[PDB]
């Protein structure tokens, strides 16, 4: 869950960060999950990092599903350059989250362990989150 | 005309109750046979096209057609439209006399085991056999020929599938 293997166009207009989650608002794979309540751009280094945290705690007990994939590339201009002269080069890959989106799913592990793991993941992550269970009823 | 006579006296007779059919138009009938030479490496040659062009107009009684390559293929030099192969279509009585002249020449040269052919099929009723010029020529000896290939042939029948092509292989052949 780091980078797209290939993209057609590599310097893309930045994403819209205003509105509500187009989809992925439900736990489909897991038992407990984690959704977001603000919006931010979530980078690959942050996802990888929240993952290590979550899965160190669960001690390789149950499964994990990352629901957010970093698709959009972003650019940064070289240091100390003036304005103009083209667009800069790719610095990282992102994937926009908006209030509602589930970011992580888990199963095959007790409820309290899952809640602790998703808590530890939440702090390595730049968006306010919430703990959710597989919606039923 | 020879096997056509046999058809209307025996095949029409026996096959009609080998499987139950109401009409006699429900009966398997052989339509034609395509005799495509296949593909010989005439990329540096252009003579072997004619070996086969003259083989087929002698083997069957009709000028063959050299269907040039469709798509451009690497490995062998087949550029878009390289002339290769030759496919004759036997529809009328010739289908019969030539078929007859196949079973009546198969055994001496084919050198086959159980039966001449087996499950060499495409699964839907067609032969796809490939003979390395063994039995094919009584008319003209192996003595006046130079290259070796497998004339590819299939079976165009009103029959449904190769399971039926076996019961019509009881048409003098060897299943």
């Amino acid at each position: 869950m780091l980078l797209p293997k290939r993209v057609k166009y590599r310097r893309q207009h930045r994403p819209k960060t205003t509105g509500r989650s187009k989809g992925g608002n439900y736990v489909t794979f897991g038992e407990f999950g984690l959704q977001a309540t603000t919006t931010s751009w979530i980078t690959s280094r942050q996802i990888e990092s929240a993952r290590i945290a979550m899965t160190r705690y669960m001690k390789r007990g149950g499964k994990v599903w990352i629901k957010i994939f970093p698709h959009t590339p972003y650019t940064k201009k070289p240091l100390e350059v003036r304005m103009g002269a083209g667009k800069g080069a790719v610095e990282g890959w992102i994937a926009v989250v908006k209030p509602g989106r589930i970011l992580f799913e888990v199963a095959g592990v007790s409820e309290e362990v899952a809640r602790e793991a998703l808590r530890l993941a939440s702090h390595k992550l730049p968006v306010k989150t919430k703990f959710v269970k597989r919606e039923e009823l | 005309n020879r096997l056509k006579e046999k058809f209307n006296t025996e095949v029409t007779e026996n096959l009609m109750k080998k499987f139950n059919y109401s009409s006699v138009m429900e009966v398997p009938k052989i339509d034609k046979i395509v005799v495509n030479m296949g593909v010989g490496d005439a990329v540096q040659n252009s003579k072997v096209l004619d070996n086969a062009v003259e083989e087929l107009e002698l083997i069957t009684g009709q000028k063959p057609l050299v269907t040039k390559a469709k798509k451009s293929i690497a490995t062998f030099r087949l550029r878009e439209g390289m002339p290769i192969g030759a496919k004759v279509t036997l529809r009328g009585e010739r289908m019969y006399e030539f078929l007859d002249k196949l079973i009546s020449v198969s055994l001496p040269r084919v050198r086959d085991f159980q039966g001449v052919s087996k499950k060499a099929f495409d699964g839907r009723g067609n032969y796809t056999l490939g003979v390395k010029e063994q039995l094919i020529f009584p008319e003209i000896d192996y003595d006046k020929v130079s290259k070796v290939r497998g004339m590819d042939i299939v079976i165009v029948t009103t029959a449904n599938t190769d399971e039926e092509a076996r019961e019509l292989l009881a048409n003098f052949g060897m299943p």
Binding site: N25, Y26, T37, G100, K130, E135 | -
Partner: protein
């Protein structure tokens, strides 16, 4: 399995619809064999009790006017954040 409901009127604006939801009421419609397209509203808290009582599928008595309609939930809407039910669809079997 004896839920009741009240009928809503034409042209319920955005403000009216959103205010119902603040008073703990969810809007819904019924359809199917044996009836017509009647738009009703039910008290959410109560509906949840019936569903946990009968589950996903249940031939439920539904209170409209004076007539009770044998009805089951075709399908439903939910708000994941601010947990609250949004619109219930109902088909009658009878």
């Amino acid at each position: 399995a004896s839920l009741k409901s009240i009928i809503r009127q034409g042209k319920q604006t955005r403000s009216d619809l959103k205010q119902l939801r603040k008073s703990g009421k969810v809007p819904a419609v019924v359809y199917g064999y044996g009836t017509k397209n009647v738009s009703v509203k039910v008290d959410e808290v109560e509906f949840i009790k019936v569903i946990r009582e009968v589950g996903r599928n249940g031939v439920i008595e539904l209170g409209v006017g004076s007539k009770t309609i044998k009805v089951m939930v075709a399908d439903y809407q939910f708000d994941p954040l601010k947990n609250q039910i949004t619109h219930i669809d109902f088909l009658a079997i009878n």
